[PDB]
Amino acid sequence: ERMTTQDVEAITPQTLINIRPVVAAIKEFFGTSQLSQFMDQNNPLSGLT
Amino acid sequence: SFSDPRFDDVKAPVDECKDKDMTYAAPLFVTAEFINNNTGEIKSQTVFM
Amino acid sequence: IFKVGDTVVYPHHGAALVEAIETRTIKGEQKEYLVLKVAQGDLTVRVPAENAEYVGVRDVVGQEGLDKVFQVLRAPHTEEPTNWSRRYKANLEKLASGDVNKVAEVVRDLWRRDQERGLSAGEKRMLAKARQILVGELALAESTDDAKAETILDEVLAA
């Protein structure tokens, strides 16, 4: 998107890169996911299980 | 272009994270590189990812 | 033209340093690809020697340009109509052009304005951004301190 809308010979990858969807994707995966569960630890066998 | 995925240190120890409810993590530094084909440069920043 | 360690001004990032010249190649010709690095954006930029004036990278402005922008100062009588949005677009186009005298004229126009009225949010951001890059340019033109150039400002900013 901003490869064209921004001006030429003034931009920099600091201006190009927005890290917010990536860090939002990571935070969304470690939370609120089917696969990310609590560590079921009432005993270390259930931890290892 | 991107290059060099490197990690930093962690921002807090484990027990301090678990007490003060901060997530245990470490930052990402990625060496990006922008090239204009029309005139020819490299733009090597170290992006905090 | 250029040598090692030259304090050289790069559009639009201002003054900077060169470290060396890579003799890397394309199509087997090892051109004089100079490496240039800044302290503002904290990055390194490889530059070929040929397109230096094409991109407009440029040696530092001397006391002649310092006296030129001081001659620009204390002569702010200019007319802008009610289309101050067109004024914002106009000096935005200025800031895109990056001429030193024009950047000086616009920051002294905004000094005239907040000296009279006060500006809006993006207007003050415009003033602060163009002011900081202009004063960085001046403070490395004289090769002195940033705050020392800021002391020069208040005695040349409408004094």
UniProtKB/Swiss-Prot annotation, chain C:
One of its GO terms (biological process) is rRNA transcription. The keyword Zinc-finger does not apply. The keyword Cell cycle does not apply. Keywords: Virulence. SUPFAM superfamilies: CarD-like. It comes from the Bacteria. Gene3D superfamilies: 2.40.10.170, CarD-like, C-terminal domain (1.20.58.1290). Belongs to the CarD family. Controls rRNA transcription by binding to the RNA polymerase (RNAP). Required for replication and persistence during infection of mice. This is RNA polymerase-binding transcription factor CarD.
